[PDB]
Amino acid sequence: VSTAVLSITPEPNFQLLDNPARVMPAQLKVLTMPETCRYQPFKPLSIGGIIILKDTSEDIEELVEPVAAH
Amino acid sequence: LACGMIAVGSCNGDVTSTILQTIMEKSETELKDTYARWLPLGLGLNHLGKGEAIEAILAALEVVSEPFRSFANTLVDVCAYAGSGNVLKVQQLLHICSEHFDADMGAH
Amino acid sequence: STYSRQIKQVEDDIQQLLKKINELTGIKESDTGLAPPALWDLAADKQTLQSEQPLQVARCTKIINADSEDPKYIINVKQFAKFVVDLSDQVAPTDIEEGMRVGVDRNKYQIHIPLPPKIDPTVTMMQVEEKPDVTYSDVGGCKEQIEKLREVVETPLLHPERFVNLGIEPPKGVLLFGPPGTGKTLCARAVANRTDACFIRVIGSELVQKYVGEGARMVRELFEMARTKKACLIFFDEIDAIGGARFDDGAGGDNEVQRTMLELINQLDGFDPRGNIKVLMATNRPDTLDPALMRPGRLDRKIEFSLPDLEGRTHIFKIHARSMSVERDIRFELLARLCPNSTGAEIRSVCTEAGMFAIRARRKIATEKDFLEAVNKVIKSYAKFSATPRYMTYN
Amino acid sequence: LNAKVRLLREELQLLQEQGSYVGEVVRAMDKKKVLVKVHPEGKFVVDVDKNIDINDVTPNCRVALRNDSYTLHKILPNKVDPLVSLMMVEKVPDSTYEMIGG
Amino acid sequence: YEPPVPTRVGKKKKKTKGPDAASKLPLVTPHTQCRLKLLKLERIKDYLLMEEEFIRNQEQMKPLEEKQEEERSKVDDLRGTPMSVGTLEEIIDDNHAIVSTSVGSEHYVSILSFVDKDLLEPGCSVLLNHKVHAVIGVLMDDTDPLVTVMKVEKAPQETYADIGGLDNQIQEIKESVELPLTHPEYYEEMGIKPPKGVILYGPPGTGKTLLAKAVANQTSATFLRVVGSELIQKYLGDGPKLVRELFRVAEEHAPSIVFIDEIDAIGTKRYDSNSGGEREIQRTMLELLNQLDGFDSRGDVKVIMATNRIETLDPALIRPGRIDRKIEFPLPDEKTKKRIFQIHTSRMTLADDVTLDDLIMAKDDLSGADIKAICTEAGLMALRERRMKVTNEDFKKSKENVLYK
Ligand SMILES: Nc1ncnc2c1ncn2[C@@H]1O[C@H](COP(=O)(O)OP(=O)(O)OP(=O)(O)O)[C@@H](O)[C@H]1O
Numbered sequence A: 001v002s003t004a005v006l007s008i009t010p011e012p013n014f015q016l017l018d019n020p021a022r023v024m025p026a027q028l029k030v031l032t033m034p035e036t037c038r039y040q041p042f043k044p045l046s047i048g049g050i051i052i053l054k055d056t057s058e059d060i061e062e063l064v065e066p067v068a069a070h
Numbered sequence B: 001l002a003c004g005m006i007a008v009g010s011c012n013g014d015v016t017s018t019i020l021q022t023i024m025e026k027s028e029t030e031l032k033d034t035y036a037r038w039l040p041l042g043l044g045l046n047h048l049g050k051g052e053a054i055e056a057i058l059a060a061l062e063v064v065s066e067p068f069r070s071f072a073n074t075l076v077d078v079c080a081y082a083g084s085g086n087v088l089k090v091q092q093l094l095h096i097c098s099e100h101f102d103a104d105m106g107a108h
Numbered sequence C: 001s002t003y004s005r006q007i008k009q010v011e012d013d014i015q016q017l018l019k020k021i022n023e024l025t026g027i028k029e030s031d032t033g034l035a036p037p038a039l040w041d042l043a044a045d046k047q048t049l050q051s052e053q054p055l056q057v058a059r060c061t062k063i064i065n066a067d068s069e070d071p072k073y074i075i076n077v078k079q080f081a082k083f084v085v086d087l088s089d090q091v092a093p094t095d096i097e098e099g100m101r102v103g104v105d106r107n108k109y110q111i112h113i114p115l116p117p118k119i120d121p122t123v124t125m126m127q128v129e130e131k132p133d134v135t136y137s138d139v140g141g142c143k144e145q146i147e148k149l150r151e152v153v154e155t156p157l158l159h160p161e162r163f164v165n166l167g168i169e170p171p172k173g174v175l176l177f178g179p180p181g182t183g184k185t186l187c188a189r190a191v192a193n194r195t196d197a198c199f200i201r202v203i204g205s206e207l208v209q210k211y212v213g214e215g216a217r218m219v220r221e222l223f224e225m226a227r228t229k230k231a232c233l234i235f236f237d238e239i240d241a242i243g244g245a246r247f248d249d250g251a252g253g254d255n256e257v258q259r260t261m262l263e264l265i266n267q268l269d270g271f272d273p274r275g276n277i278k279v280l281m282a283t284n285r286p287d288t289l290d291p292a293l294m295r296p297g298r299l300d301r302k303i304e305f306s307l308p309d310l311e312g313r314t315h316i317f318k319i320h321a322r323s324m325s326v327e328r329d330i331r332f333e334l335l336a337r338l339c340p341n342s343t344g345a346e347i348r349s350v351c352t353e354a355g356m357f358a359i360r361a362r363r364k365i366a367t368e369k370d371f372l373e374a375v376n377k378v379i380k381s382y383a384k385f386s387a388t389p390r391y392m393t394y395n
Numbered sequence D: 001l002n003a004k005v006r007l008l009r010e011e012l013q014l015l016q017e018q019g020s021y022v023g024e025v026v027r028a029m030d031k032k033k034v035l036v037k038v039h040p041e042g043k044f045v046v047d048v049d050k051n052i053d054i055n056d057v058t059p060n061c062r063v064a065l066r067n068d069s070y071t072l073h074k075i076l077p078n079k080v081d082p083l084v085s086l087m088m089v090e091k092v093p094d095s096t097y098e099m100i101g102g
Numbered sequence E: 001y002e003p004p005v006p007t008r009v010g011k012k013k014k015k016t017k018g019p020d021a022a023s024k025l026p027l028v029t030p031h032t033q034c035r036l037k038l039l040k041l042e043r044i045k046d047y048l049l050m051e052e053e054f055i056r057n058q059e060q061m062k063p064l065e066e067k068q069e070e071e072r073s074k075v076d077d078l079r080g081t082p083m084s085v086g087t088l089e090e091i092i093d094d095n096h097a098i099v100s101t102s103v104g105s106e107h108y109v110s111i112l113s114f115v116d117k118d119l120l121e122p123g124c125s126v127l128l129n130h131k132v133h134a135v136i137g138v139l140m141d142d143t144d145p146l147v148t149v150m151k152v153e154k155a156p157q158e159t160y161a162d163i164g165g166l167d168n169q170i171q172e173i174k175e176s177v178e179l180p181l182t183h184p185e186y187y188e189e190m191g192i193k194p195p196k197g198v199i200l201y202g203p204p205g206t207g208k209t210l211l212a213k214a215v216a217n218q219t220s221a222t223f224l225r226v227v228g229s230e231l232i233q234k235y236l237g238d239g240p241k242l243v244r245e246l247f248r249v250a251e252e253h254a255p256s257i258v259f260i261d262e263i264d265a266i267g268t269k270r271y272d273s274n275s276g277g278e279r280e281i282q283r284t285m286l287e288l289l290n291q292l293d294g295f296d297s298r299g300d301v302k303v304i305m306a307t308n309r310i311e312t313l314d315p316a317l318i319r320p321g322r323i324d325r326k327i328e329f330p331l332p333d334e335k336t337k338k339r340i341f342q343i344h345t346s347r348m349t350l351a352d353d354v355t356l357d358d359l360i361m362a363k364d365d366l367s368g369a370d371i372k373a374i375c376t377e378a379g380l381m382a383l384r385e386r387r388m389k390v391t392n393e394d395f396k397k398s399k400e401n402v403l404y405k
């Protein structure tokens, strides 16, 4: 304070997960990939784990670059 | 000190010129001596109770070095308002006491 | 009334500011004896609580093998126990003597500091700390009485050089006696006001104690504490309480009080030198005092406060009517003549009643008639209750 | 049964806790302080447990004080009224109008 | 080694008690609501406004350890719990003193900084740390049970209007116990100290205690009442000790009025419980002589004494300087006796056949107590017959009960 004056003076409903995706055991039952994606899971995606994805198209394969260990 | 007693509260022009002249002619190390504290009193004595006739004098004290200027500015301003009770001036005085320094810079 | 609204506004702000100041500074408690925070050195107090250990008060009883390099001290720790202890290394062996109180720690009980002798709190309260507001100028008609009083109780302490050079031992005792109201305690109050040495006021009725030998104990501790001073003055007001003459009425009549008087006699002039104490006793019944107490060397000077003469009574009238709003030509010599044998106490009352009649009549100045009526009311009307006629036979 | 067994094992430890002093309240003070008289050990100025109301600490009340902190933690049943104790020793026989004749 | 030397002058506590502490704001005059008072009121406010800003700035940059609530918390830590209550035996130094715990064991402890050092006196109750016994506070001594006995907590309901015929007596007693306090300027402009003491003497029932009761009703000063027979104690020196303590309570509660009622009863009555005989009573009197007019300076204490036997008192006790005024209370005359009957029959409902003139001459030596006793017994007689109206027969049987038999 200055001198005294004297007398005079909107959380989203969804969230996208990259590959690999940290998916909870409970997220599996609610997590489902978008319809328009070129990849479709072989087994149901709610099972979890390693899932092989069918390819509808034959375009350039955009992979995920490996990361070196610390 | 002595010239201050002869010309106390008189605002003598002659003594003001020489006291100011001596104050800035002294060295930075010379003003460190505590006997140098007396030169402002002689200037302060001349304006004892005069009041606001110091703004010209206080302007002259601007040119002199620190921390002697802060002491000289405070002293002569005090003798200006001696026996006046001007609370606004006392308001400034308490602000000077408010900020503490961890002696040399706090002589004023 | 125009400023009434604004005055309360600034009065309330000041009270609110005052309370707000007390919030930061702190003005509270005061029932556990807490000092204002301006005197609080908390940093030091924490250091004292560790650096300075507490010391238990003990009395040395005997030093064993004081000649050798291993002197052992027997101490009596009040009601706790008795210990044979050695001296601490931060005090000198010559500083501890047998029979002297010492301070000992709680671990090995080694003596850490000598202590002053134990004095009864009642005896400690007997020394005058605030001097009276009465000077010798307030005592009239006692010119010869005061000079005799001063040259024994004041002059030796003020200018001791005038007596040592001539080989003079000034008297160390004065007895003031006279009828009540004659100025006995008034002069002693003037002595305490003027004195520079320690003054101890002792009322004889204060020396009367419930238990056997307790009254004589207080006399011993009184002179013990008076001796702890370079020069001291003891005032024994109403010494007839304990100074009565010894007698044997078959039963043990006044045997205990006589012992207190015998102790007082012993300290004044006994085997041991008294010290630089100059005693001073006042009594309105000097005929009742013991011959041993009324003997030179205990009460060397016997100053009599007889009723004032005409010059003395006029002087006392001037003293008490000094600050009054009296008239022009108050014949104070005439008023002194209207009360032939009257104490200074009656004269003061005459002055008070004289102005009291003026207050009665809503008058700001006391006339001579008011004093004449005051003399009639005090000297004449109140002569039935006069203590003078009975007490001149005693003095 | 299980709680009864559990209370018994904890009781052995609880019985080893030092007992509480018995004191008489002289007068309650500010800041939740009370002046008490421990039975053989004179007077103390003590704190009051957070579960004891300072308004219930009346003068001349028996209270239990902790072993080390001497904290007032329990209001013991009040002692005999001094007037009652005075009238027990005097022991004036109780009377009614029916036992008065003439 | 050298003995410690105190910086404080003497061993006694400060005389001032119960002040405004730091709330002693300057006395602003005049009290009239004017600009000068407003200017002075603002002047006090201005400095406080500076004071508030200055103190806040320091505490703002003060270390977290050094704070008003933190330092107070640290004080409690330094004091500890429990807080032992001891006795101050001697003040060795400013920060050192000799104290004794309740077990009688003395200790040489250190007076801590936060202790109110000007409340320290020998014999006072000191608060000590439980562990290190250092002086950590002073116990504000509770009101002694002896204090409660003297003090008349509630002023009596008897006024001066309830007293009849003692017009001069009221006027003399007012001028020494009432006028000096209500209008002290009258005495200062005259230069006279008020009449020091007053004694009320006369036959029994003449109104000596009644006037004192009227004094206690209209007094702003503390009223202490002690009957003279209460100064006869069962132990030696206790009587003198009690007289000394009675005026010590008077000193604390200044201004005060001490009423020594039935002062003559101290010597005219001999009790075997008094171990010392007339000799202890004499020492009790000698203490009373010192308290009335002695060496110690007396504050604002006015002494009222009452006795029906003033000839039996020691003449030195009621000498001027001790008791300046000797107000006599004679038996009422016809004019006063009628007023006393009207005073005590005012709240009564009387019969038309009762007359106070005939009741005036019930007895030649009729006192106010006899007049009042006639009335209350007359009302009691009416109460027996289940009546509210007192008849002349009730008064007739009243006189034969109190005055005779
Ligand atoms: N010589 C005097 N000059 C002036 N005033 C006097 C003188 N003598 C007595 N007085 C006044 O009379 C009062 C009587 O009190 P004082 O203490 O002098 O009596 P005292 O002689 O000691 O009596 P007691 O024998 O009853 O103790 C004094 O307080 C003082 O005001």
Ligand SMILES: Nc1ncnc2c1ncn2[C@@H]1O[C@H](COP(=O)(O)OP(=O)(O)OP(=O)(O)O)[C@@H](O)[C@H]1O
Binding pocket: E162, E163, E164, E165, E166, E203, E204, E205, E206, E207, E208, E209, E210, E211, E306, E307, E308, E329, E332, E340, E343, E367, E368, E369, E370, E372
């Ligand atoms: N002058 C009076 N006017 C009115 N009532 C009076 C008067 N005198 C006495 N009385 C009544 O008498 C009652 C008893 O008298 P009181 O207690 O005043 O006696 P006292 O004069 O102190 O005498 P003592 O103590 O010697 O018996 C009072 O309560 C009061 O009601």
Ligand SMILES: [Mg+2]
Binding pocket: C184, C185, C237, C238, C282, E293, E294, E295
């Ligand atoms: Mg005297």
Ligand SMILES: [Mg+2]
Binding pocket: E208, E209, E261, E262, E306
């Ligand atoms: Mg009575």
